[PDB]
Amino acid sequence: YEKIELTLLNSLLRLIMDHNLADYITAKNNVTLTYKDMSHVNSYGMIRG
């Protein structure tokens, strides 16, 4: 899960489904993760939740 490239994942999801759904999934994995005063942006790896 930790080592998933979002561009390659977007390419493979574009292979198996419509590009709008693939783009939605890939953009949904690229979000800001916050815990209390700690915050970063997930740009590499997979959001399992």
Partner: protein, 48 residues
């Protein structure tokens, strides 16, 4: 974090910002939360 921070550039985009945005949208498809720190705007501003 999206509007009221005055470290947000709230004017018309310069041209070099537009080539930066287009190149970054070419190399990172739909990763707008990643593109936006590099361009210098917010994710919604870059997407719009």
């Amino acid at each position: 974090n999206e509007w009221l921070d005055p470290s947000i550039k709230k004017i018309e985009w310069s041209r070099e910002e537009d080539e930066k945005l287009l190149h970054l949208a070419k190399l990172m498809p739909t990763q707008w939360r990643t593109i936006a720190p590099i361009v210098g705007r917010t994710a919604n501003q870059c997407l719009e």
